[PDB]
Amino acid sequence: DCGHLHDPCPNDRPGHRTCCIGLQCRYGKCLVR
């Protein structure tokens, strides 16, 4: 279970992020790692 590239990540935690592969959670939002 993963989110989109520009999708939100409020439940972002170490070891279980809401971002898919090749993504990163920053600024309360997800972006391209």
Side-chain angles (χ1 to χ4, degrees), residues 1-31:
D1 288 303
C2 67
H4 316 150
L5 156 58
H6 296 303
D7 243 29
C9 52
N11 284 289
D12 162 80
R13 38 183 273 182
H16 208 84
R17 295 199 265 283
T18 75
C19 292
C20 237
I21 180 168
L23 295 178
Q24 168 149 243
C25 178
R26 296 289 162 186
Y27 317 95
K29 254 164 62 128
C30 201
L31 17 152

